[PDB]
């Protein structure tokens, strides 16, 4: 029987599946190997799915000769030579696109956390020291208060769905406008980037990767925009300039930072820092993140993990994996 | 079985994997068909490869009725009514990111072949004449000297990082301002265009198509040029003004001129010439001239139509393509 490698942890009936028809190598841990254990465990392997820090280049594939097929649970494959996977003869395989809601879901619990102080909330009942209401940790609103969405790609789109019931005065900009009913149903108004940063309590920068803009939102749009206002990113890490974020938060400017996502995680960008500012870090007060859980929910997870193993399944049988990116030989 | 007509050459790889999904209709030449038979290909077609060649209105959409989706192999789509497509129920998809560095190394180039006389001196040694070092085709060197980027988007980004080595005085002119820790890894310094114009020893407009603007480097910007400056233009052929750049070449007050693009080829624009200005066709000793290469690497044309190609595979099969700028219904 044929070899699968896993690079990252999937769930068991992901291993019982493939197991019908390769012999699987699990990783069993939530850790990512280093690439030397990887290239060891595929060394011999005729199949591997790939992940988000996984790096295909030629190096890698000269060491894996037996590779068929790398079917990738990613939906694009900015990380992998895809033109050396064909050259050795290996399918290179993605997924279609299932993270728009679950992150448009966590950008608005992003929201919340950050403007009603829950964290901090949370802090103090871990203490003990909580014996009742008191007059602390006042917030901010969402109701009557304006909030603009940069991009209105799918997942700005379906934050504004969402926000619809709250009560608010939705802004976005975006060069193509929604459709008519759709502005009618979700009372979003369109309107130019000038007007969306001097007017907004809340900025959100969710554009579609079509339209894409390094540093979207730098010093100079910072100074732009309403003072104590709030920024949430959970687009990409590039959109937003960390920098800039701590100057605002220092200056007053900003009253909260919430992030999803940082610049250091991206590796295709030569300005590339490794480590998220300390200056972000040790703001417990205005600052709420999560680590990349942009898409960490068990259904959609496994959805993504399913259809990467269909694609393992397919090649190994000498069927053109219903995902190809590519053409191998 | 879905058609698609692919309107220009592409790789056969592109070819077979567009092949698993659909029936394909390439252009097996290196030429670009006319209007009447791209549309004649195309009317029963459900999918359309388009390139910069092809101009989509509604009356191309209404002769292609089964027309489901155009995948632009393309970033800048000046040439595509999105508006028309979405009206005819017509996924519009673009391809971002890859032409960002091809085009930052061509203008680098241009800059090299223009300032050192290298098309010169290749004549010179065809010509059969070379017996060995003469006293002549004494250009200007890059180090110490100024040169300035109008526009310091993707590709005025991808210059300053190349050129940052090359031990020169950068200058940049943009509405957005870098930020300051790329002004200090490039040591790049923001001016106005008037300070640019003033003391730059090279120009190089990287600036988008716009209403005015358009012919920005005109008579009048010349006109404060230093004495014996060069222009390297690689952006949109309408930025500068042609004639301008002639009249600037025999006067003196320019040494050179190397373009990769034409103002004959806006159609954009009534003020449209049908030919390159012979007077710079013929001035080889003061001009470098490509014919809108800036992409014309082979391996990133391969990625492009492998973009565009998953795009199409993508709307056919019932996804939202990745590239999508548009959402018909
Ligand atoms: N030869 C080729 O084959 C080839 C290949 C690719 C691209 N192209 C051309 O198509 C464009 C896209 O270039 P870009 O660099 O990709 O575009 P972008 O980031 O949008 O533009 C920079 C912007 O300049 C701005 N700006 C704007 C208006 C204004 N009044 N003042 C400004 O200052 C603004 O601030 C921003 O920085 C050209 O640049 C040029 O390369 C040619």
Redesign the interface.
């Given at each position: 029987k044929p070899k699968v490698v896993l690079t990252h942890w999937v769930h068991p009936e992901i291993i019982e599946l493939l197991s019908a028809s390769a012999d699987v190598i699990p990783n069993t841990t939530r850790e990512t190997l280093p690439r030397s254990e990887v290239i060891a465990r595929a060394k011999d392997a005729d199949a591997l799915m790939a992940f988000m820090p996984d790096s295909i280049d030629s190096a890698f594939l000269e060491e894996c000769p037996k590779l068929r097929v790398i079917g990738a649970a990613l939906?694009?494959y900015d990380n992998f030579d895809?033109?050396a996977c064909?050259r050795h003869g290996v399918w290179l395989t993605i997924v279609?696109?299932l993270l728009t809601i679950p992150t448009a879901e966590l950008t608005i619990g992003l929201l919340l956390g950050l403007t009603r102080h829950m964290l901090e909330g949370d802090r103090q009942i871990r203490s003990g020291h909580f014996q009742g209401w008191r007059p602390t940790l006042y917030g901010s609103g969402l109701t009557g208060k304006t909030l603009g969405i940069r991009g209105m790609g799918?997942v700005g789109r379906a934050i504004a769905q969402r926000l619809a019931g709250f009560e608010m005065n939705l802004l976005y900009c975006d060069?193509?406008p929604l459709?008519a009913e759709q502005e009618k149903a979700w009372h979003v108004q369109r309107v130019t980037l000038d007007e969306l940063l001097e007017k907004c309590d809340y900025v959100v920068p969710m554009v579609?990767?079509?339209?894409?803009?390094?540093?979207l939102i730098?010093?100079?749009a910072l100074a732009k925009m309403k003072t104590g206002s709030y920024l949430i990113n959970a687009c990409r890490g590039s959109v937003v300039?960390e920098?800039?974020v701590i100057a605002a938060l220092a200056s007053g400017k900003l009253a909260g930072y919430a992030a999803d996502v940082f610049e250091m995680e991206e590796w295709i960008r030569?300005?590339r820092p490794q480590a998220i500012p300390k200056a972000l870090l040790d703001n417990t007060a205005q600052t709420f993140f999560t680590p990349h859980l942009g898409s960490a929910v068990k259904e959609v997870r496994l959805e993504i993990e399913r259809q990467a193993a269909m694609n393992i399944i397919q090649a190994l049988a000498g069927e053109?994996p219903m995902g190809?990116?590519?053409?191998p030989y």
């Open positions: 939906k694009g895809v033109n064909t279609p696109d799918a060069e193509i459709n579609p990767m079509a339209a894409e803009t390094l540093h730098d010093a100079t300039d920098n800039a030569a300005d053109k190809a990116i590519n053409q």
